[PDB]
Each structure stands twice: as C-alpha cells, then as structure tokens.
Amino acid sequence: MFENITAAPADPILGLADLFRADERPGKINLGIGVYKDETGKTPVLTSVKKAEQYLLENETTKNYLGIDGIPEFGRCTQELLFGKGSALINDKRARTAQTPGGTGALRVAADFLAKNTSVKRVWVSNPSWPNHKSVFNSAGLEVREYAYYDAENHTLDFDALINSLNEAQAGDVVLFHGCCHNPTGIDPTLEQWQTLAQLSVEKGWLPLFDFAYQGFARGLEEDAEGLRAFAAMHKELIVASSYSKNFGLYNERVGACTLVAADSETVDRAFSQMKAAIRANYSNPPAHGASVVATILSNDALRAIWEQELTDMRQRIQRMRQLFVNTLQEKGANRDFSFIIKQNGMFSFSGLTKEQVLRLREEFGVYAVASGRVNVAGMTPDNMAPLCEAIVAVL
Amino acid sequence: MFENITAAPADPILGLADLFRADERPGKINLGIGVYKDETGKTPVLTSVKKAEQYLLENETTKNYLGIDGIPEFGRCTQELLFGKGSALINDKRARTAQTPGGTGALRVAADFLAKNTSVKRVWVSNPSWPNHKSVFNSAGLEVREYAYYDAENHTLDFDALINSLNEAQAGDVVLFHGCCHNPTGIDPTLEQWQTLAQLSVEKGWLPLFDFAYQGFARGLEEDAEGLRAFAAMHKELIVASSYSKNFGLYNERVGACTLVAADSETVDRAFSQMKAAIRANYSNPPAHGASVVATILSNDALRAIWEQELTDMRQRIQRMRQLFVNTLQEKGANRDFSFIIKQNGMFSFSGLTKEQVLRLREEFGVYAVASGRVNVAGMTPDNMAPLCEAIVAVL
Ligand SMILES: *Cc1c(COP(=O)(O)O)c[n+](C)c(C)c1O
Numbered sequence: 001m002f003e004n005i006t007a008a009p010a011d012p013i014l015g016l017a018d019l020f021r022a023d024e025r026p027g028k029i030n031l032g033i034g035v036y037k038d039e040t041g042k043t044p045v046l047t048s049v050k051k052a053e054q055y056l057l058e059n060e061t062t063k064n065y066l067g068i069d070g071i072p073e074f075g076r077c078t079q080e081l082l083f084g085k086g087s088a089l090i091n092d093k094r095a096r097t098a099q100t101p102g103g104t105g106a107l108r109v110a111a112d113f114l115a116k117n118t119s120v121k122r123v124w125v126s127n128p129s130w131p132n133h134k135s136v137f138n139s140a141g142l143e144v145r146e147y148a149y150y151d152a153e154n155h156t157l158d159f160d161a162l163i164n165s166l167n168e169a170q171a172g173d174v175v176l177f178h179g180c181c182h183n184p185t186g187i188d189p190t191l192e193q194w195q196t197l198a199q200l201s202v203e204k205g206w207l208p209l210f211d212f213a214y215q216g217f218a219r220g221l222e223e224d225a226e227g228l229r230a231f232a233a234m235h236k237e238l239i240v241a242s243s244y245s246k247n248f249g250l251y252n253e254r255v256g257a258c259t260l261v262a263a264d265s266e267t268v269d270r271a272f273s274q275m276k277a278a279i280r281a282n283y284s285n286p287p288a289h290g291a292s293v294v295a296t297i298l299s300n301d302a303l304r305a306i307w308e309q310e311l312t313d314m315r316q317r318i319q320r321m322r323q324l325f326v327n328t329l330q331e332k333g334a335n336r337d338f339s340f341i342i343k344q345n346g347m348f349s350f351s352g353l354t355k356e357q358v359l360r361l362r363e364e365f366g367v368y369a370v371a372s373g374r375v376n377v378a379g380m381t382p383d384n385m386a387p388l389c390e391a392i393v394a395v396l
Numbered sequence: 397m398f399e400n401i402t403a404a405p406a407d408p409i410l411g412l413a414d415l416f417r418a419d420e421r422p423g424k425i426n427l428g429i430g431v432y433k434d435e436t437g438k439t440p441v442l443t444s445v446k447k448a449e450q451y452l453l454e455n456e457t458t459k460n461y462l463g464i465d466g467i468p469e470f471g472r473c474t475q476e477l478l479f480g481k482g483s484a485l486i487n488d489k490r491a492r493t494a495q496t497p498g499g500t501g502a503l504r505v506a507a508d509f510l511a512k513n514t515s516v517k518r519v520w521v522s523n524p525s526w527p528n529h530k531s532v533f534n535s536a537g538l539e540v541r542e543y544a545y546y547d548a549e550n551h552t553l554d555f556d557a558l559i560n561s562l563n564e565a566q567a568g569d570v571v572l573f574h575g576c577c578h579n580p581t582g583i584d585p586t587l588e589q590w591q592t593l594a595q596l597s598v599e600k601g602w603l604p605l606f607d608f609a610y611q612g613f614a615r616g617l618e619e620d621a622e623g624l625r626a627f628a629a630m631h632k633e634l635i636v637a638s639s640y641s642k643n644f645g646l647y648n649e650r651v652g653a654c655t656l657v658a659a660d661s662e663t664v665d666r667a668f669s670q671m672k673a674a675i676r677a678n679y680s681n682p683p684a685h686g687a688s689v690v691a692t693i694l695s696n697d698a699l700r701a702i703w704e705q706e707l708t709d710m711r712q713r714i715q716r717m718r719q720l721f722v723n724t725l726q727e728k729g730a731n732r733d734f735s736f737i738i739k740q741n742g743m744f745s746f747s748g749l750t751k752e753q754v755l756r757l758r759e760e761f762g763v764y765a766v767a768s769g770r771v772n773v774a775g776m777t778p779d780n781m782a783p784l785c786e787a788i789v790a791v792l
C-alpha cells in the first residue's frame with residue numbers, strides 16, 4: 001500500500017527547527033518560527049501561567065472529558081476579549097465559541113464546517129500570507145484564490161490593488177483577513193481602511209473569516225481588535241479563529257478558539273451543532289490544561305494583572321530590537337535603508353531578502369530565516385545582533 | 397450563509413452527559429460514557445499522574461512548540477507497549493509514531509493520510525462498533541462497509557459469519573479491528589482466532605487498522621496486545637490508533653498515538669512525512685501536558701510501578717461490579733439469565749436491552765445508558781447497584 005508514496009517536502013516554517021537542531025555550528029542563530037525570546041535567548045514559561053498551573057495542581061479533582069466545545073468560562077472570556085466587555089453580540093446571544101487545539105485547529109474546524117454545511121468553494125487569502133493557510137483550506141476541499149496586499153517598492157499596503165483584486169470575489173465566498181500583525185508583512189490596515197473594507201464586504205456579500213493570532217502584539221489588546229469590531233458591527237455573520245499560543249506563551253499546549261456568529265440566537269445555535277459534529281469526527285473534545293490556564297488567569301484579577309504586564313514587556317522588548325536591528329545594519333555597512341521595518345508590527349520583519357540570500361545565510365553563516373525573507377525580531381537579542389547584521393550585510 | 401443549516405442530531409454517547417446534567421432528579425445514575433468510577437462514584441485523577449504533574453511543574457522551562465509528531469520519548473515508550481520490549485519492528489526501524497489528540501485524533505490522522513496518499517475507498521468496521529467510527533472515516537471521504545461480528549442469541553462472536561462477511565472485502569481495503577475490549581460487545585477473539593484472522597488478511601491483501609483504546613483492561617498490558625502482535629509478525633504494513641485516556645485516566649488532556657509500520661525503514665519514513673503533512677493541515681503539532689505525563693511515568697521505575705498497580709485496581713474493581721450486577725439482577729427478580737456479561741471484558745456490559753427499554757429507563761427512572769443497550773459497569777458502585785437493578789427489572 002505504501003511503496004509509491006513519495007515524500008512530502010519540508011514545511012517552510014516548522015521544517016526549519018529540524019535543520020537548525022541538526023546544525024553543528026557553535027554560533028547558529030534561529031530567527032525562523034514565531035516564538036518570543038527574552039534578553040537571554042530563552043523562551044520562558046510566563047510567571048502568570050506557572051502560578052495558574054500551581055493552582056490547577058492543587059485544585060483539580062478529575063481529568064473527565066470536557067464537552068465538545070470545551071470550557072465555557074474560556075468561551076465567555078474569549079468573546080469579551082474579541083468583541084468587548086458589554087458588546088451587543090454577547091448580549092443578544094449571537095456568538096458561539098468552541099475551544100480548539102490552537103489557531104490552526106480553529107482554522108480547520110472552520111474549513112470543515114463551511115465545506116459540509118455551506119455552499120462555499122472559494123476562500124480568498126492575501127498575497128503574501130502564512131504558508132499553512134493554503135494547506136488547511138485545501139484539506140477541507142476548498143479552493144484558495146489570492147488577493148493583492150503588499151507593495152514591495154514603497155513597503156506599504158497597496159489598498160487600491162487589494163480593493164481591485166477582490167472585485168473578482170463573488171457573493172458567498174470567504175475572505176480571510178488577519179486581525180492584526182499581518183503574517184508575513186507586518187502591515188495592517190488603518191481603522192479607516194478597516195471601515196471601508198467592512199462596508200464593502202456587506203455590499204458584495206462576502207463571509208469574513210478573521211485570523212487572530214497576535215492579540216496584544218501591535219498596540220494593545222483592545223486596539224488590536226478595532227478592525228474585527230468594525231466588521232462585527234456591520235455584519236450579521238462571521239467566524240474568527242483566535243489563538244493564545246503567542247500572547248500567553250502557551251505554544252505547545254495548543255489553546256485557541258473558533259467563534260461562530262450569526263443573525264440571532266436560534267440560527268447560531270443550529271449552526272454551532274454542526275460545528276460540534278465536525279469537531280467530534282476529528283479529535284473528540286479539546287485538551288484541557290492550556291485552556292484552563294487561560295481561563296484561570298482571565299478570571300482572577302491578580303493573575304490577569306501579572307499577565308498583561310508580561311505581555312506588554314514582550315511587545316516592548318520586540319519594539320527595542322526592531323530599532324536595534326535598523327541601527328546596527330547601518331553601522332555594519334548595509335547599503336539599503338532598512339527603516340521600513342520599524343513601521344511593521346508583531347514578531348517579524350519582512351526584510352525583502354531574496355530566496356538565495358536566505359539560503360546563503362544558513363549555509364555559510366548559520367542564521368536561519370524563512371525563504372520569503374521573513375525574519376523573527378523577537379528571536380533577536382543584544383548578544384546575537386552584531387554577528388547577525390554582519391551576516392546580512394555580507395549577503396546583500 | 398447559515399439560514400438553512402439544519403441542526404445536527406445529538407451524539408449517542410457524548411450527548412448523554414448534556415441530558416444527564418440537565419436532569420433535576422435527586423437519584424439519577426450515569427452509566428453512558430466510558431469513564432471509570434471508583435467505589436465512591438468519583439472519577440479521580442490518578443496518583444501516578446498527580447506526581448508526574450508535580451514534576452513537570454518544577455522541572456519545565458519552556459512551552460515552545462513540539463515537533464509535528466510530538467515527544468520522541470512518548471513515541472518510543474508507546475511502540476514498546478504495543479509491540480514488545482525488543483521487537484523486530486523496533487529494531488529494524490520499521491515503525492513510526494506520531495502523538496495525537498487522543499485515539500479519535502489518531503483515527504482521523506490515519507483516515508486523512510490514507511485518503512490523500514493511498515488508493516483506499518472502503519474501510520470495514522464491525523457490526524456493532526463505536527458510533528463515531530463511521531463519522532471519522534466519512535469525514536475523510538472514505539466509505540464504511542460493515543462486517544458481521546456478534547451473535548446476539550448465544551452472546552458470542554459469530555466467527556464463521558465474520559469470515560464470511562469479509563469475503564466481499566477486496567485487496568487494498570482497510571479492515572478495522574479492535575485490539576481488546578470490543579466496543580460495544582465486550583467479546584474479543586481468542587489467540588487462535590486472531591492467528592486465523594492474521595493469515596487470512598495476508599492472503600487476501602487487506603490493510604489492518606487496529607483500534608487500541610483499552611490496553612490493560614481485559615487481562616493485562618502484554619496479554620491485551622497478543623492479537624496485534626500476532627498480526628505484526630505476519631504483516632508488512634499496518635497502522636494502530638492507540639489511546640491513553642482510559643488506562644491513564646487522562647480523558648480531557650487528549651493523549652493518544654498513531655503508529656504507522658511498513659516493510660522497511662526507507663518506506664515508513666517516506667510515508668510518515670505525508671502523515672506529518674496531514675497533521676500540519678489540521679491542528680499543527682500535538683498538546684504537550686498529557687503526553688509528557690505519560691512519558692514521565694513510563695520512564696521512571698517508581699512512577700510506572702505505582703501506575704500499573706492503579707490500573708490493575710481499576711480492572712479488578714470493574715470485575716467485581718460485573719459479578720455484583722449479575723447477582724443483584726437475580727435477587728431483584730429479573731427473568732433473564734444475565735450471566736453472559738461476566739464473559740465480556742472492559743468497562744461495558746452489552747445487556748441486550750431494547751431502544752425503548754433504554755429510553756424508558758432515563759424518562760421514568762433516570763438511569764442513563766446508550767441506546768444500543770450498552771451500559772458502563774465501571775460507573776456502578778455498591779451504593780447505586782440496587783436502585784439500578786430495580787429500574788432494569790421493572791422495564792423487562
Ligand atoms: C503563529 C501563528 C499561528 C500558530 O497558531 P497555533 O495557535 O496553531 O500555534 C497560526 N496562525 C494562523 C498565524 C497567522 C500565526 O502567526
């Protein structure tokens with residue numbers, strides 16, 4: 001049965017850790033997968049989650065199966081983070097949320113639901129986007145069409161070309177938007193651009209699918225949700241695939257959420273019973289540990305207060321490294337004004353390096369970056385910054 | 397988009413906890429989902445896992461993303477449990493295992509892999525089987541055909557009818573076998589029947605898919621794997637979907653495994669890179685907590701020694717309740733010799749009650765059982781045994 005199965009190619013992001021950990025060189029720098037690092041080059045487990053895990057240890061009684069949709073406390077806390085404390089969607093009982101294994105898991109549950117219970121065929125994703133977006137929707141049977149987004153010349157969002165691209169998108173199609181910290185470009189719409197985009201989705205009848213993996217990493221928790229909230233007010237139906245991997249540093253515990261909203265309570269509950277059936281035919285119900293850590297923190301005033309200070313420390317540290325990368329590329333002799341990456345937000349810098357420059361950087365200098373030129377700024381420290389900028393100027 | 401989505405029906409097993417927890421009656425007994433209960437009617441978190449969780453608390457440094465296939469220690473310990481300490485499959489590097497979200501998650505990863513990378517169309521599952529078997533394979537696009545298994549008259553495995561059913565199964569088809577504690581009947585093949593079955597699979601060219609959710613619940617850890625090991629010796633290729641929910645009492649942490657075996661090392665590694673790609677397009681990589689608890693225990697002599705004593709205590713307690721159910725149905729006046737359930741193993745008793753008797757039991761007496769007549773013996777205690785048998789004799 002397996003004699004003719006040819007090998008899958010390596011994953012552009014996850015396949016980099018395989019290679020990096022097989023590299024023997026005593027100075028190699030990682031920069032590939034989007035994981036935060038502190039000043040010492042360690043990815044620590046946050047204090048707020050270590051204390052929540054203590055609590056869980058001494059206060060859990062059972063490991064008995066959670067419902068298909070997970071912990072309800074989790075689900076209420078998520079909706080309030082996404083839509084606002086005292087939103088109309090929460091009060092009209094218009095939103096239903098299931099707990100999933102991370103944002104990828106939330107994106108697949110969404111694709112399965114839509115493939116089985118809706119008339120969609122096309123999903124529209126930005127050029128460029130996270131690589132694994134194509135892969136998840138195609139697994140469900142859905143085709144993936146592309147919309148323009150970045151202007152590589154001016155290092156801006158080409159908004160007139162995005163508008164124009166999306167005029168080939170029909171009523172009934174899904175348009176995937178990133179809520180904040182666009183992966184890979186780092187360029188987000190302004191509130192004004194998000195409002196234009198919202199009225200145009202209503203007018204043309206597109207179903208918004210928001211990918212929201214970086215809440216808290218651009219300006220702050222509530223600010224980062226302005227785009228989504230501008231849409232939620234205009235729209236009867238939308239789905240958001242949220243993740244807590246990043247902003248809670250809970251990467252390997254797999255905690256995320258798939259929130260479904262419809263016109264009213266009766267409809268969203270009908271729709272959600274099908275999303276529950278799609279979940280049962282995949283994994284059966286969700287992993288409890290990471291998700292009850294999120295819920296313990298969000299519920300406790302003290303533990304929440306320690307967490308959004310740990311999250312603003314992470315965002316501020318990346319902010320300093322983005323400046324330090326631009327300053328040190330200048331004193332190392334790069335002839336290219338790299339000042340545009342300071343305007344990008346999130347964990348990454350989309351440097352504009354070519355696939356060959358990226359490839360020469362791992363093979364000669366041992367610094368690992370994604371083949372699109374995406375580099376992880378949150379992986380940069382003051383100690384690896386000069387060997388790093390020295391490697392990039394030599395390849396330019 | 398969602399106006400015409402009609403409601404999915406409730407899950408026969410998981411939908412029972414929704415109903416039970418909405419029942420107001422002060423004497424209702426659960427008996428539906430396969431979760432162990434101790435003498436006090438509590439599902440406790442085991443001591444061996446509570447100590448492993450302590451360890452994890454004080455010794456983890458990061459929550460950084462695990463590889464697509466999970467913890468390798470976990471993967472080596474699983475293969476040794478399944479195939480034996482010093483098996484040829486382990487030494488010829490013929491087996492590859494990925495960590496999944498429970499046995500359901502392992503079964504879906506298997507269905508996706510097979511749908512995308514193989515020529516299969518049909519999967520053969522026993523009559524009767526776990527309900528959710530149909531649902532998982534159909535999600536991947538595969539059809540599910542049925543093979544005879546139980547003789548409801550004599551309360552035995554109708555082996556000549558199973559053999560005969562499976563003669564309509566073609567070369568290249570998948571036949572799903574339960575490794576031990578058949579869900580729902582409780583009737584397993586003898587070693588001799590498993591050997592006959594193994595030589596016949598080789599002869600007819602079927603791909604074995606073993607479902608192995610109950611290791612340790614029939615006779616013991618190694619004994620329960622005799623059927624699988626009889627097949628593994630005869631076969632070049634097979635896949636086993638294992639779970640640790642039951643035997644570790646880690647139900648809601650979602651820990652299981654999908655093991656792929658092929659003729660040689662080169663082939664199984666080629667095949668496994670496609671199974672890794674199917675996993676990345678679903679959730680991205682697996683939840684760490686439950687799986688590193690399994691791995692901490694299996695690795696430590698003391699913690700492993702406390703665990704297989706906690707597991708033999710669970711199996712022995714169910715054994716006593718199976719006798720106590722048969723004895724108390726007799727002194728409560730049931731005219732039906734219910735002695736056949738003593739020969740069934742695992743957590744359940746397939747009582748032979750009709751769908752109407754089952755339905756009358758929740759609506760008048762508040763005892764909850766699956767609509768096939770499957771009752772959970774491990775949910776029975778000496779304190780709920782008489783109200784329970786009183787309810788069943790009144791419905792007969
Ligand atoms: C980091 C990241 C992820 C990873 O999600 P998990 O929660 O599954 O780890 C997912 N998406 C969709 C994006 C855009 C992203 O940057």
Ligand SMILES: *Cc1c(COP(=O)(O)O)c[n+](C)c(C)c1O
Pocket residue numbers: 283284430497498499500501526579607609639640641642647651652
């Ligand atoms: C209890 C049980 C399960 C549940 O598996 P999880 O590990 O996903 O909880 C799965 N199967 C396949 C069977 C047969 C079973 O009894």
